[PDB]
Ligand binder design. Structure first.
Ligand SMILES: NC(=O)c1ccc[n+]([C@@H]2O[C@H](COP(=O)([O-])OP(=O)(O)OC[C@H]3O[C@@H](n4cnc5c(N)ncnc54)[C@H](O)[C@@H]3O)[C@@H](O)[C@H]2O)c1
Ligand SMILES: NC(=O)c1ccc[n+]([C@@H]2O[C@H](COP(=O)([O-])OP(=O)(O)OC[C@H]3O[C@@H](n4cnc5c(N)ncnc54)[C@H](O)[C@@H]3O)[C@@H](O)[C@H]2O)c1
Ligand SMILES: O=P(O)(O)OC[C@H]1O[C@@H](O)[C@H](O)[C@@H](O)[C@@H]1O
Ligand SMILES: O=P(O)(O)OC[C@H]1O[C@@H](O)[C@H](O)[C@@H](O)[C@@H]1O
Ligand SMILES: [Mn+2]
Ligand SMILES: [Mn+2]
Ligand SMILES: [Mn+2]
Ligand SMILES: [Mn+2]
Lengths: 407, 410, 413, 404
């Protein structure tokens, strides 16, 4: 008997998650999927749509409580968004007036998002740990930072951080070369939204050169960049390496949050009567990453998945306990890190810097300290100068006063 | 186009290796297998037997030189025995006179086997390196020790040490639980002939406790580890550990019986005679290392990804041991590459043995590189099963006299 | 105001310690030295002798309790022997019948000595921690193993393990070259009673070769021959003999009186002399480990001032030997200044030395774990891991014997 | 015993020689030999030197670098590759891209390094194949040059010095009325990128009191910053932590190099006739004291640039760091300090990665890899400005560096 808990069932991505679950239900047994959400009305619409898609292939349940969802669960998926789109709007917009990048996961936006998430994830990991001891698969942002927090501070081992960029990238290369997903093997490492690809293999063949060539054929890295750095770079690195250009673009356009308010409102209307997943829905591929991971956690085949976990030797010149986004051998409930060699100095300058920042943030959270928050904020590469840091922090703390208090 | 070189064609294990290569030739392209040996008359009988088994499914060739074999080979299998069974006989026989364990791969006998191998493998790695840059798959003993030497001193990356105990153990477990070889997954670490298993998984299920229980029911019994030992140590232990943990008992056994090398001599000589006329592999042969080699080569060729226990650099597989120790450990093998997998921490009890003989392995290598009799004494004294200071000068002199043709130290 | 507690004040070595304390009392201020011992009658004799030597240069006190000795102390010196000479006699003699080395600190003898010391040191460190938080300076054996235990399990930072073989060696070298103690600088590392010297400097000059050459014209059958030093190229702690000359040491130990029994005779003779002596008796001066005293006093001295001096002590590696984990408690040279111990960089350790250090360190930690869990099964595992431990066929009976002999001090289940 | 001085014409040379005179009582110095590419400049300086020295040791000029370092036991690097005109370009060109322009920090330090590598490579090589002297380095950027020599040229006896550690200790000793050697620091970081966590004076932890006194204008760190961060920070961090404020300051004034040029020209003219030293000034006391303590068997603490080797436990052994070392008889021993703070580690890791990318770009003479190095510096260009910035730098340093 096998049950999957979904926390944040009201999410507009839920339907693609269920499609993934339906696709794997032929290979592994799923008796029930149970949904929990703080917003009951929004989840009911979604879950009614889900019921119509499942057609009784497994049971679809709603729990009124988080504990009721997770108590008999073998897997718990975190899909919730602390503070909601209103929080994300604050995250993106507040840093702008200081001349800083405002973005959901990167920089000061990621910092306030993290402060909102930590108390909720703390409460949730404790409950899971006192009951089912499930494996937790996390999408909640910021995903890598939360993983660092849970793995090295709460010390819950079966917490796996996921993101959609690895799977989107493998998908790209597969269609480029007309091969299957698992035919693609990468040298890949970094932090969630801060990742680097060094080698690309397809069916065993080294096609790195061909990937670089194809990337060529003005918000995008120019050609000379790839020739210089020789890494395929996470698109999110644009906020670092093209800061002035990104700032100008964010600050002269509607906040991204506000725009997804409109998209979400539209999808919910469609969900009332929809018989199949609406095109306007189709980070959509997060879903396939979750379901394939659960699938390969369930069997004894042994498969490669890029996930957020402790380095443990994946990258030889980084400390073992850094949570990284890296390729692992996944089999029967365990995740094994795979040897990759040395990481490039360019990549490591980013990885170290934000690893230090994100640990300063965690410490500041754990001690509920304004002083240490300032120290965390000054350390982020896209953080404030000294002259703006106090005002910025106060603004962040006031906006997040329902979620966290620092003294 | 794809060629495999076999170095030591005359081995009496050769037919098994070729059976293996025949089995994989359906999943993987093999155009030719070429054989080399220093003993042309021995090899000729073996290869003749081989030709009757192969039946032109691939091309079978003999080369007159090492270089002729390895040029244009993608894989090179070392299965030669430096100094022959007479060397083995000196390895086993000489320590005995000093009250020391005499054994092919363990202790002083392994020391002398190492010194015999190093000059040949140093020549062979050199030629491979300057021609084909083939992956070498090593069985030549002592295999883990030779691997340490090639990886960290000659610095040739594509050198993979193999051994027979991992495969035999997995095979045992699979039949215990009625499962396939690959259904079995181990937490396994240590040195060649000095390994430990901490966890056994069959089809995902942790069956470690059941493996311990069934070892209790296994059945000369007072020459194995008693029940309480498994209860105390909580490791499944390589049977070679008996030479360390039960030294007095094992010494008594070895020194009141025919030297093993002498039984082997007789076995090999009866096989050899059967090879002159056999149309199928005989039973006196059956032994299963030559399915570890074929499977490795196969999984090195495809893009499937498969687990193999092999001798290679730790690289984080055991987190509380240095990256550069060559260990016998599970690896993910795929498309020419061998990746170490996380296993967490090693047990303090296993680590005590691993560190000590690793240090002895490096001292022996260093004594060989400087060709130093002084440094050889130092290496000998460092082995847990080595001589006391009062016996060391004489033991070394006797070993160096016996290995005159193979080793020269100043 | 500055107080030193001496735990095990009844020890026959106390008079040499006090003499060291007297030598330093000119450089650093000592107001009082307070003594504690479980044996009150034996301590009274020794302390009456001490009072006569001190001549009111500082106060000499006795505390009837451990807590009363350490409560206001800045330094606490551990000088006690858990289980006494009777315990030591069991440690030396029990292993003999199994064909094993029986010795005060090395092998099976050190294992049972550790098992007796751990509960007492737990109790004592806890009391020091809850009161004065003094720096503890340790001679109680096995000193290196107890340091490993306190530093990495009890996690009490100001616990410094000492031994007398470093200072005895430095003294030899000074005399050999006519130089002062501090003019000697060593590359030195290992475990207590398990140490190795790679380089010797005198007044900045590398004199290693001269030391090796001199070691030979030191005329016998019981010590390393000349080819050994030429092969190994390390000056080795003399305790290494039990490892590298096992067969010869076993026969020596088994064919003479147990060492503890003959020390009972030496001690009983010293105590009679202590009743009336006005000066340190010679019989004490040339024996056992008499210069431990000078090690303790110079350490305390240099912990008190801000000069900065080198002392070989037992502490965490922390980069002294780049070849070993940082947390290994090692016996190594440290820059000692104002209450702190700073490890000094030394480069790589030799493979030969490392094989010993690794092996014994793993044994040490297995023993600690077995103690902490009060586990008979884990104690077996520890015993089988020692390079001088029993074979499988002997291990159970040998553990049983040890546990019965130490039943007043520890219980394992 | 002879000392070689590479850069004899430096306007700092009189101070170095004063220091060498102060130690010549505790240690034997037979001769100090000077070399410079600018013979006319050096001649005036060395003549002034000869009047100060008064034959207490022999003072010599050599016409070649080789002539100076042959049979020297110590060799002091105090030359400035490309001169004050180099520094002017280092300071001025970044400005045009909205970047901090400064002698040793950021893009200005990048071009200074590229200018120094060819010369030090040649010099280290000559020393190694002749006398095998200890080289004491002041040539900037000193920490970066030391990373280069220790880890790429792999010449062990090369010790990087800098001015800030001694200046700090001097402030502290005066604050508490103690000697220089009474002060002990938990000190770590890179050159011009350093942090103090603990201050001890005569064994007393006076860190708290150093914080309080620092509190007792708008161009330095405010009080809350020390309360937050709890590190005493090198003043150069302002270019990182207060970039906007520093950029506005540097970009609205004459370049620092111009001030220095006027100061040096005034001093040089004074040297023609001076009988005593007139009114980084005292790094030429860290050099003499280092050489002194390398010579005796006392053992003394000096903060210097060298391999970490476990001095900071959570940093790799091979990072060259500016850290306290036990100095005795030709050797430099690192001392245990425990762990480094995450905040200071973020800076150290980043600039260290940038340092190695820069050296790697130099060794392969690669324009491509230089762009990579430039992009990696926390104070480097955005992608949109990188190609032009690099071209401008390469154009300016035509005579010293050539990249393909
Ligand atoms: N890592 C990735 O590639 C990736 C991709 C997409 C989304 N995400 C993250 O997943 C989350 C999904 O958010 P979304 O885009 O659907 O926006 P959203 O705000 O609509 O969030 C989804 C649901 O979470 C619920 N929720 C909020 N807080 C909760 C809590 N404390 N407990 C239970 N439920 C709670 C809300 O009611 C909402 O229905 C966000 O954190 C988002 O950033 C991550
Ligand atoms: N590390 C070294 O180089 C070194 C050198 C000399 C002695 N030691 C050790 O120091 C200790 C001193 O022993 P010793 O040789 O003087 O002989 P000893 O056996 O006579 O013991 C010293 C005194 O300690 C007292 N004592 C025993 N247990 C005690 C306890 N639990 N609390 C307080 N006092 C206690 C006894 O009454 C005795 O008078 C021993 O452990 C010895 O091995 C170590
Ligand atoms: O702008 P949105 O529709 O909210 O999507 C934003 C999403 O972009 C993806 O690339 C990231 O991996 C997600 O973690 C992120 O949340
Ligand atoms: O037999 P003993 O007189 O008691 O001597 C035993 C002493 O020997 C010394 O070499 C050791 O360093 C001491 O730790 C030990 O206490
Ligand atoms: Mn993502
Ligand atoms: Mn009493
Ligand atoms: Mn009593
Ligand atoms: Mn001792």
């Amino acid at each position: 008997h096998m049950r999957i808990a979904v926390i944040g069932g009201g999410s507009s991505y839920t339907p693609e998650l269920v499609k993934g679950l339906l696709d794997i239900s032929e290979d592994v047994r799923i008796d029930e999927v149970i949904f929990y959400d703080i917003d009951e009305e929004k989840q009911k619409i979604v879950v009614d749509f889900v019921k119509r898609l499942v057609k009784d292939r497994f049971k679809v349940l709603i729990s009124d409580t988080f504990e009721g969802a997770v108590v008999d669960a073998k897997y718990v998926i975190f899909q919730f968004r602390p503070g909601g789109l209103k929080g994300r709007e604050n995250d993106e917009g507040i840093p702008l007036k200081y001349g800083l990048i405002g973005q959901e996961t990167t920089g000061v936006g990621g910092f306030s998002a993290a402060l909102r998430a930590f108390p909720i994830v703390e409460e949730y990991v404790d409950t899971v740990r006192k009951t089912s001891n499930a494996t937790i698969v996390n999408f909640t942002n910021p995903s890598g930072h939360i993983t660092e927090f849970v793995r090295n501070y709460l010390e819950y081992e079966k917490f796996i951080g996921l993101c959609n960029v690895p799977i989107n990238f493998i998908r790209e290369i597969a269609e480029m070369f007309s091969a299957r997903l698992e035919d693609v093997f990468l040298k890949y490492y970094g932090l969630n939204h801060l990742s680097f690809i060094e080698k690309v293999f397809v069916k065993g063949e080294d096609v790195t050169e061909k990937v670089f060539e194809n990337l060529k054929l003005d918000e995008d890295f120019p050609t000379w960049f790839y020739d210089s750095v020789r890494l395929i770079v996470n698109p999110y690195l644009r906020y670092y390496l093209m800061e002035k250009k990104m700032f100008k673009k964010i600050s002269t356009h509607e906040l991204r949050a506000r725009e997804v308010m409109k998209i979400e409102k539209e999808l919910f209307e469609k969900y009332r009567t929809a018989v199949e997943i609406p095109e306007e829905l189709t980070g959509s591929m997060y879903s396939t990453a979750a379901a394939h991971l659960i699938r390969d956690l369930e069997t004894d085949e042994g498969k490669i998945h890029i996930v957020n976990t402790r380095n443990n030797g994946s990258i030889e010149n980084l400390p073992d306990d850094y949570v990284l986004e890296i390729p692992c051998y996944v089999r029967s409930g365990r995740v094994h890190t795979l040897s990759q060699g040395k990481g490039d100095h360019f990549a490591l300058s980013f990885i170290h810097a934000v690893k230090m920042y994100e640990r300063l943030t965690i410490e500041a959270y754990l001690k509920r300290s304004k002083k240490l928050a300032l120290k965390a904020l000054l350390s982020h590469p896209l953080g404030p100068d000294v002259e703006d840091a106090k005002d910025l922090l106060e603004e962040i703390l006031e906006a997040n006063r329902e979620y966290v208090k620092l003294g």
